[PDB]
């Protein structure tokens, strides 16, 4: 039972777009929950309901009729005012036993570039992760270039953490990966 937010009715080729976004913002579990409903014409937000404001507000002059009219209706205001508990807090309960429980462990691989060492940390969820390079248990930090967190779109992430190094005899290079789905951080070594 995931609850949705409804949109209120108003009082090369060219194209016209309308977007409605019923959004929820969660912080510290549920002790800090915020709801923001966004009415969007093309790419311009025109009307908005922020739970911290408690009434409809026109972002631009185009949404000025709607905000005034939607505020006129005590019924519509009162439904929207209770949506934070009814939609956001209610749906976060379903999220706690599904999405927030998803644990996909990352796959860590080291390979020289196509000098430069590439630590590929692929297919992990959630997005929280930390990757550090070590050289003889001495953390390398100045020659490390990390690609941004890549969203694969299939509920998995990946990231590539490069390191430009000078290899000498008897030097081991390890990629240290920490992730919530791991009982202990993964270490992948590399010898030349």
């Amino acid at each position: 039972q995931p609850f949705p937010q409804p949109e209120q009715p108003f009082p090369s080729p060219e194209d016209f777009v309308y977007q409605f976004k019923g959004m929820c913002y969660f912080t510290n579990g549920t002790e800090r929950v915020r709801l923001v409903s966004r009415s969007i014409y093309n790419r311009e937000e025109i009307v908005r309901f922020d739970s911290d404001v408690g009434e409809f507000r026109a972002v631009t002059l185009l949404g000025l009729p709607a905000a005034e009219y939607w505020n006129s209706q005590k019924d519509i205001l009162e439904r929207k005012r209770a949506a934070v508990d009814r939609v956001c807090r209610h749906n976060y309960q379903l999220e706690l036993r599904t999405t927030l429980q998803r644990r996909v462990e990352p796959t860590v691989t080291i390979s020289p570039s196509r000098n430069l060492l590439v630590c590929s940390v692929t297919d992990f969820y959630p997005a929280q992760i930390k990757v550090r390079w070590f050289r003889n248990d001495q953390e390398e930090t100045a020659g490390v270039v990390s690609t941004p967190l890549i969203r694969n779109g299939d509920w998995t992430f990946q990231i590539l953490v490069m390191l430009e190094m000078t290899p000498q005899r008897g030097d081991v290079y390890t990629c240290h990966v920490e992730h919530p789905s791991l009982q202990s951080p993964i270490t992948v070594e590399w010898r030349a």
């Binding site: 609850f3 016209f16 309308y18 019923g22 913002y25 976060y92």
Partner: peptide
């Protein structure tokens, strides 16, 4: 925020 959810994302266009 710690988590951002959209319930949901509504889209309608003329073309």
């Amino acid at each position: 925020a710690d988590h951002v959810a959209s319930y949901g994302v509504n889209l309608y266009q003329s073309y």
